[PDB]
Amino acid sequence: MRVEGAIGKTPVVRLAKVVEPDMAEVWVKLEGLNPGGSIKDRPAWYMIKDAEERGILRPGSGQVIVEPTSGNTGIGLAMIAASRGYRLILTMPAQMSEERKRVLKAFGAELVLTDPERRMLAAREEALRLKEELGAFMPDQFKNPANVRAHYETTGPELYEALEGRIDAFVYGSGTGGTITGVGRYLKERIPHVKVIAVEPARSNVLSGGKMGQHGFQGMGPGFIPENLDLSLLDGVIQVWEEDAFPLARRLAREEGLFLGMSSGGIVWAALQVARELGPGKRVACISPDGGWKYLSTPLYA
């Protein structure tokens, strides 16, 4: 079995200290336990695997893959690219941590820095150009149906099976929209009354009607509605503030022994609120995108 085969089958834990007596049960799936350290392993592998299936990519060819990403997707892709013999090129703002660059380079990925002023736009522009020049494959994580497909085929099934189908609400901090759509559809088909609740930064509450803005929940709250996010699935949206979430992430590490990432703090915080709403005899499920290792420099853990 290759590294990709080790993707998924992550455990789920039930919170026992940060919950309150009248709360519904709260379960968290630890995606930080994937080979690449995050939930992106799934989408990364599926977008490339799908590309192979369609005859766009040929394994061990050295073919070029390019994607504009400054987060876990770049890591997921670098890991997969390294395994299947692909030449990966990632575009990103120069403000990128002199820490995150090292891991990406460790997998042999090529990093192309872009105007820190233009940001996401410049990164995408450069990636598109490279796509054209090198005739490379571009995942395009926000529009790629294979992103959703990964969670519809693995993440969803895993969560449903591990929780014996006893799920009243599913909570997630949407980023590319793939996880909530993927898991969302899967659970809906079998638990039609299940409530799918999205979570977004209060400071960039585009799903609530608000407007884009800076926020510290790395990995989620893109500042717009991506093509991969199916709104029809949502039964509500919870806005989370760094002021409440970070302290909670600290309680999680300290009291539950769960050292999770920034997006996790907001997501679990949301799950907790949904848990108060539903009450005893109900089970709320959510997902921890990644661990707290890559955020030791943020005020969340400094």
Ligand X SMILES: CC(=O)CCCC(=O)O
Strands 25-30 and 12-14: antiparallel
Please pick, among 263, 264, 288, 294, the residue that the annotation labels catalytic.
263
Distances (CA, A) of 200 to 141, 219, 241, 269: 18, 11, 9, 11
> Residue 177 has which token pair?
């929209």
For residue 6, the partner it binds in ligand X, ligand PLP, a second copy, none, with Cβ less than 5 to 8 A by kind, is a second copy
In the complex, the smallest distance separating the C-beta of residue 5 from ligand PLP, rounded to whole angstroms, is 21
Task: For the segment 253-272, give every residue that binds ligand X (CB under 6 A).
Answer: none
For residue 253, the partner it binds in a second copy, ligand X, ligand PLP, none, with Cβ less than 5 to 8 A by kind, is a second copy
> Residue 93 has which token pair?
């703002």
Phi-psi region of 234 (alpha: psi -120 to 50; beta: other; left: phi over 0): beta
Binding part of the chain for ligand PLP, among 19-27, 37-45, 105-113, 268-276 by CB under 6 A, reads: 37-45
Q: Give the nearer residue to ligand X in terms of CB position, either 195 or 294.
A: 294
Residue 40 catalytic?
yes
Strands 283-288 and 87-93: unpaired
* Site track for ligand X across 188-227, x = CB under 6 A: -------------------------------xxxx-----
> Residue 274 has which token pair?
């949904």
Q: Which of 10, 34, 63, 72 binds ligand X (CB under 6 A)?
A: 72
Determine the Cα–Cα distance for residues 123 and 114; give it in Å rounded to an integer.
6
Phi, psi (rounded to 5 degrees) for 207:
-80, -25
Task: For the segment 73-112, give every residue that binds a second copy (CB under 8 A).
Answer: 79-85, 99, 102-103, 106-108
Binding interface with ligand X (CB under 6 A): 40, 69, 71-73, 175-176, 219-222
